Amino acid sequence: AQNPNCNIMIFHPTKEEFNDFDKYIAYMESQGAHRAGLAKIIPPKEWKARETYDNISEILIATPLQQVASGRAGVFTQYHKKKKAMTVGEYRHLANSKKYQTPPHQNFEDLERKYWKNRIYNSPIYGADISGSLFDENTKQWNLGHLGTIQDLLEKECGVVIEGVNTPYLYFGMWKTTFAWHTEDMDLYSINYLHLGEPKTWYVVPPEHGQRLERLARELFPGSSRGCGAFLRHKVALISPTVLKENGIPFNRITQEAGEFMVTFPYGYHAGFNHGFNCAEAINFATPRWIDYGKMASQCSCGEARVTFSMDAFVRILQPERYDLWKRGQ
Ligand SMILES: [NH3+]NC(=O)c1cccc(-c2nn[nH]n2)c1
Ligand SMILES: [Cl-]
Ligand code: NA
Ligand code: NI
Ligand SMILES: [Zn+2]
């Protein structure tokens, strides 16, 4: 059995191995990468996403979000307060201001300690889920806007055409910008590229142990759990590595740097934070191995989670018994 301890694996594909995306995902899984929930892929030296990042300043962040915490340093929720629009250039200047800039620190571990000690006392601002892409159209390898669609995957595996599209999103982060514990919609894969800037630290729970995390979350956020049987779907709960370790929850951590890809695997819970101003791009995707995870994915039907149009078909076809109840929550 490959990677029995569910360690996060790091891959260094050659330029030849970088041609066929699906093939490489399958190769990583043949090595047990998925057991960890998250893998890092370092592109070959011959590859680049686009020529420069010199001309990105005019991109608009239509609704920046201020992430306001409640709770305690290691166990907190965050809610997203909407702010007035601003450009990426304006956001970059804000991230670098004395109020929001990354503090002096010795190494990634010192910064990690400062994050978990101090995050709740600040409210960082970020740009999230901005449809768009920064890959140049001439980048033919691992271009996140040119991947096979989930709708086509389902059609290929199960035989029926469905409506819906699948396009990338941009994220602009600053110090302490936080992504709460979650799996992807319908327990899809994700792929995540860090285009520019400071690092992003990730925490992940092996898929085989996701229920352990759920059980702990239920204990630590008891009101939220009563409100929804899949409340981690809401993407607002944080639990620190110290608290995870105290509670015996299996997990791993890794820092992604600019120029690196991260893949999350079906039912791999993840959370993390940004070290300073950065830009990432991400998209969900599927493979044949996802289908069984999609069939079995929990769903939030309390109303809070969101309205993702593309998800409808996925629930409708894979989860017919649940569909009407889920559709009401939409
Ligand atoms: N699955 N991918 C993610 O959860 C992900 C991808 C890119 C950026 C972020 C993110 N970075 N800061 N807040 N959220 C999350
Ligand atoms: Cl700090
Ligand atoms: Na470990
Ligand atoms: Ni995610
Ligand atoms: Zn819910």
Curated annotation (Swiss-Prot):
One cellular-component annotation, GO: blood microparticle
Record-annotated JmjN domain positions: 8-50
Nucleus in keyword set: yes
Modification type PolyADP-ribosyl glutamic acid: residues: E16, E17
Domain JmjC: 136-302
Binding annotation for Zn(2+): C228, H234, C300, C302
Cofactors that this protein relies on: Fe(2+)
Subcellular location: Nucleus
Record note on cofactor: Binds 1 Fe(2+) ion per subunit.
Record bears the keyword Ligase: no
Post-translational modification: Ubiquitinated via 'Lys-63'-linked ubiquitin chains. Deubiquitinated by USP14 with the help of TRIM14 leading to stabilization.
Domain of life: Eukaryota
Binding-site positions, Fe cation: H182, E184, H270
Residues annotated as binding 2-oxoglutarate: Y126, N192, K200, K235
Keywords: ADP-ribosylation, Chromatin regulator, Dioxygenase, Iron, Metal-binding, Nucleus, Oxidoreductase, Transcription, Transcription regulation, Ubl conjugation, Zinc
Main location, first listed in the record: nucleus
GO biological process, one term: positive regulation of chromatin binding
Summary of the function given for this chain in its UniProt record: Histone demethylase that specifically demethylates 'Lys-9' of histone H3, thereby playing a central role in histone code. Does not demethylate histone H3 'Lys-4', H3 'Lys-27', H3 'Lys-36' nor H4 'Lys-20'. Demethylates both di- and trimethylated H3 'Lys-9' residue, while it has no activity on monomethylated residues. Demethylation of Lys residue generates formaldehyde and succinate.
Similarity-based family: Belongs to the JHDM3 histone demethylase family.
Protein name, per record: Lysine-specific demethylase 4D
Organism field: Homo sapiens
Lineage: Eukaryota, Metazoa, Chordata, Craniata, Vertebrata
Full protein stretch here: 11 to 340 of 523
